[PDB]
């Protein structure tokens, strides 16, 4: 836990990045809205717990050749069992990345 990087970076065309993330979102059965060409709001229903989690995606330019995809979780509005908003955010990001990138 030494060098932490914000989101993930890519040298792929920004249009290709956004298009591929949108295809992943739909393949993953998440709902979404296009706020900007580079800013998406996504909503996911937990198929186990029936809860809804929201996050934002924002594409940035970091170089002349390089883009950064940033993920931000959106805050909602004895034993525990099902659910953790924070962990579910990580899994959402992970599923989205796996299903659209590299």
């Amino acid at each position: 836990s030494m060098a932490w990087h914000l989101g993930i970076r890519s040298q792929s065309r920004p249009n290709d990045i956004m298009a591929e993330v949108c295809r992943a979102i739909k393949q993953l059965d998440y709902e979404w809205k296009v706020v900007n060409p580079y800013y998406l709001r996504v909503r996911r229903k937990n198929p186990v717990t029936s809860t809804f989690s929201k996050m934002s995606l924002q594409l940035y330019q970091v170089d002349s050749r390089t883009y950064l995809l940033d993920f931000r979780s959106i805050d909602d509005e004895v034993a525990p069992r099902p659910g953790s908003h924070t962990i579910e955010f990580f899994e959402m990001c992970a599923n989205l990345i796996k299903i659209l990138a590299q």
Partner: protein, 304 residues
């Protein structure tokens, strides 16, 4: 004394009140290889990590140094018989290997629950790591320990309308353990030490000389150091050599006598930031142990 300033303070404070402004939390997916998980504990400077079952979408348990100890002892004995399964186990597979029918569900506490409830849960469940979990989010906010709890009590009661029991000795209050003390010698190999930890369920072992005088302390804390090495083959080395891997000047083992007041013991323990004192006689011979567990159990059942 009784009904206590402590008992009342604990009932009137929430677990939230003891969480630091800022903390870190390491969580493992249960599909994680056990070997990688224990190296992550070291890397992050952390005992205890909540475990997340992705299929179930819930926290299911904790991973602690004790779990590491159980696994190494198993690994060490299995190797002598040419069975090498263990260190390619995922957290999941080892959990089913020991949480067999024997059921140990995750114990947690709400941020809105009292500190009294936290102390009771720790004691009742015979546990050292109590994750504070927000019911609204399901998020683990913090892992509550006896060390943090006692420090908090020392600090925020630090006024003294003082209970009479605070001026009484460990002897008269009967706080601590004074028989069947698990100890090792200078030369005792680490794997022997592991076996003792596994059998006795005890967080540290006084290292004693030929006359039974204490010269060092071998903690479970000192055991995850081994997770940094790539061989695990150095379990045949003595406890002394294993303790060289410590960070800091080891000033000496923190001791006390049976005749010191609870106040003096609480003060020494909180300032030293250690889990126990080794109880000793006039001549450094070990007579017992007074642990954070002993103290908190006494304070919750009203001092001593």
């Amino acid at each position: 004394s009784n009904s206590s300033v402590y008992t009342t303070f604990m009932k009137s404070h929430r677990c939230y009140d003891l969480i630091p402004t800022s903390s870190k939390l390491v969580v493992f997916d249960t599909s994680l290889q056990v070997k990688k998980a224990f190296f992550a504990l070291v890397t992050n400077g952390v005992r205890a990590a909540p475990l997340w079952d992705s299929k179930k979408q819930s926290f299911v348990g904790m991973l602690t140094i004790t779990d590491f100890i159980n696994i190494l002892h198993r690994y060490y004995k299995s190797a002598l018989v040419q069975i090498y399964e263990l260190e390619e186990h995922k957290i999941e597979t080892w959990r089913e290997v020991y949480l067999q029918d024997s059921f140990k569900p995750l114990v947690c506490i709400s941020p809105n629950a009292s500190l009294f409830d936290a102390v009771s849960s720790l004691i009742r469940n015979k546990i050292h790591r109590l994750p504070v979990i927000d019911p609204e989010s399901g998020n683990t906010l913090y892992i509550l320990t006896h060390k943090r709890i006692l420090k908090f009590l020392k600090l925020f009661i630090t006024e003294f309308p003082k209970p009479e029991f605070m001026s009484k000795s460990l002897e008269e209050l009967q706080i601590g353990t004074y028989a069947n003390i698990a100890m090792v010698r200078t030369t005792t190999p680490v794997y022997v030490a592991l076996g003792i930890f596994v059998q006795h369920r005890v967080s540290a072992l006084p290292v004693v000389d030929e006359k039974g005088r204490v010269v060092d302390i071998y903690s479970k804390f000192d055991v995850i150091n081994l997770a940094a090495e790539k061989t695990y083959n150095n379990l045949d080395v003595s406890v002394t050599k294993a303790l060289q891997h410590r960070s800091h000047y080891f000033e000496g083992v923190l001791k006390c006598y049976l005749h010191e007041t609870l106040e003096a013991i609480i003060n020494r323990l909180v300032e030293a930031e250690v889990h126990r004192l080794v109880v000793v006689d006039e001549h450094d011979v070990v007579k017992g142990i007074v642990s954070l567990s002993d103290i908190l159990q006494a304070l919750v059942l009203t001092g001593g």
